[PDB]
Amino acid sequence: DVSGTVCLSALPPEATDTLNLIASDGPFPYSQDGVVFQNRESVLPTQSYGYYHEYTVITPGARTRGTRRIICGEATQEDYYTGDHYATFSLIDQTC
Amino acid sequence: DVSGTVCLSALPPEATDTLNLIASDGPFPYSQDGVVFQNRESVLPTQSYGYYHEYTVITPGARTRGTRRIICGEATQEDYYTGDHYATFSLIDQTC
Ligand SMILES: Nc1nc2c(ncn2[C@@H]2O[C@H](CO)[C@@H](O)[C@H]2OP(=O)(O)O)c(=O)[nH]1
Ligand SMILES: Nc1nc2c(ncn2[C@@H]2O[C@H](CO)[C@@H](O)[C@H]2OP(=O)(O)O)c(=O)[nH]1
């Protein structure tokens, strides 16, 4: 299940960076940006393979790509944030 | 993010000295000159480890290395100046 919505202004600023890149179709910092998200744990609504894609949300100070990601779906503004490597997701509200 | 581009002539003259030393591969005044800059805070574009290196920009009168540095990237003419110990950066334009 999606854990409610979260205002974009409340997320780490890098979340805004990633959305901006998704809007311009990159260029993305990591070669893994834009790969299909399989939704293998079925936390998000079931859809055909390829419906969701994932993008890194950089964690300043981390030595790796870390655990923050934005997952997009095909619907308009259908963007989910996860800060715990897909354990939980929130739908991003870009209006607050 | 990079703050903007600044002409080399608009930076302290010591920035010029540092760039001249980098062009001749030293010798450098400090042993830390030329070590890898990790980009740990993710201020500059994401790159592999070792893409960036740091060099001191001498602060006249200082007893320590101070807060001025030139960070080079592996690309042609990619050099950034920081006067606040990596809080902010400007790309240096050596053509003006
Ligand atoms: N847990 C999980 N990882 C997924 C899923 N789809 C793609 N992945 C990616 O597959 C990897 C293998 O576990 C994960 O680290 C994640 O890589 P990312 O680090 O790029 O997010 C999914 O549905 N669940
Ligand atoms: N803030 C910061 N310091 C770095 C980085 N890479 C190397 N350093 C150097 O590592 C030290 C310990 O974190 C910093 O004080 C700085 O020492 P310098 O002034 O010698 O560059 C980096 O990516 N960020």
The DSSP string of A12-67 is -HHHHHHHHHHHHT---SSTTTTEEP--TT--SPP--TTS-EEEE---TT-SSS-S
The CATH number assigned to the domain with range B1-96 reads 3.10.450.30
B69 CA closest ligand 2 atom index: 21
Enter the tokens of residue B54: 């740091």
Interface test with A, best of B36, B38, B39, B46 (most A CBs within 10 A): B46
Q: Look up residue B42 and give its DSSP letter.
A: -
**d(C-alpha A81, C-alpha A89), whole Å:** 6
On whether any CB of chain A is under 8 Å from the CB of B46, the answer is: yes
Q: How far is CA A20 from CA A8, A48, A90, B24, B75, in A?
A: 12, 26, 18, 40, 25
| Closest to B72 in 3D by CA, of B22, B30, B32, B25 | B22
Enter the tokens of residue A89: 């997701």
**d(C-alpha A78, C-alpha B14), whole Å:** 51
A60 CB neighbours in chain B (<8 A) are 40-42
Report whether A67 contacts A84 (CB < 8 A).
yes
**d(C-alpha A70, C-alpha A16), whole Å:** 10
* Length reported for chain A: 96
| Closest to A19 in 3D by CA, of A63, A65, A80, A62 | A80
Enter the tokens of residue A94: 């870009």
Q: Look up residue B49 and give its DSSP letter.
A: T
On whether any CB of chain A is under 8 Å from the CB of B48, the answer is: no
Show me where the domains of chain A are located. Answer: 1-96
Helix (H, G, I), strand (E, B) or coil at A10: helix
**d(C-alpha A16, C-alpha B33), whole Å:** 35
Place of tokens 């205002």: A7
Q: What is the largest CA-CA distance in chain B?
A: 35
Enter the tokens of residue A54: 């994932």
| Closest to B69 in 3D by CA, of B11, B3, B4, B1 | B11
**d(C-alpha B46, C-alpha A32), whole Å:** 13
**d(C-alpha B96, C-alpha B16), whole Å:** 12
Give the torsion through C-alpha atoms of B39, B44, B47, B52, to 10 deg.
Answer: -60
Helix (H, G, I), strand (E, B) or coil at A81: strand
Radius of gyration of chain A measured on its C-alpha atoms: 12
Enter the tokens of residue A67: 């655990």
Active site residue B54: yes
The answer to whether the Cβ–Cβ distance between A60 and B40 falls below 8 Å is yes
Report whether A69 contacts A59 (CB < 8 A).
no
Q: At A12, which amino acid appears?
A: P
Report whether B53 contacts B37 (CB < 8 A).
yes
Q: Spell A18-27 as b/e; 16+ CB within 10 A means b.
A: bbebbeeeee
| Closest to B45 in 3D by CA, of A25, A30, A68, A67 | A30
Ligand 1 centre distance from Cα of residue A41 (Å): 10
